[PDB]
Description:
Blueprint: H1 2-26, H2 35-38, E1 52-59, E2 65-69, E3 75-88, E4 91-99, E5 108-112, E6 126-130, E7 141-145, H3 153-156
Antiparallel strand pairs: 1-3, 1-7, 2-3, 3-4, 5-6
Amino acid sequence: MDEDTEDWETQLQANRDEKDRFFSEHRQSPIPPEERDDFDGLSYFDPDPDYRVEATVTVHETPESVDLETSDDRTVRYLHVATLSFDLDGESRDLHAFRQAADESRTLFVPFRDKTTGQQSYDGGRYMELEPDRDLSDGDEITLDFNLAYSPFCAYSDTFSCPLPPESNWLETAVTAGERTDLEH
């Protein structure tokens, strides 16, 4: 574990830092004027290896059109290129990996709606983004860090039409890692 996980920390000190300034410098803060009045940051779970899981990539050769959110006050069509099957909470869970049109910036966007959605966290789901070492094909593996699941633009700003996640990525388990986010302030 320690061999790949020290490298997971190498990518992570850069990860949390570049994602933070994606929400601050790249795009202006999606966190409401009301919310960020007391709070300041991309709502972030603290690095937890138990919510760092391993999944087998199942790549679909003919991708369907799935509307998900972007960082540009907009909603954009993604293509269903993969499904990531892993173990979590005593059974095999699956999360579908999409990318807008013909992405090669490694930017895989996976939604997962769990038990903390609208309870221990804000409603809409928990949204997670992977950028692997390479491009994934049927048979590859990929690491799903739910402990790095980001604050979605939709759940914070109602001016974003919220993504449309398939029934298959709805997880019947709680993802509690690091700090939470109190929607009921």
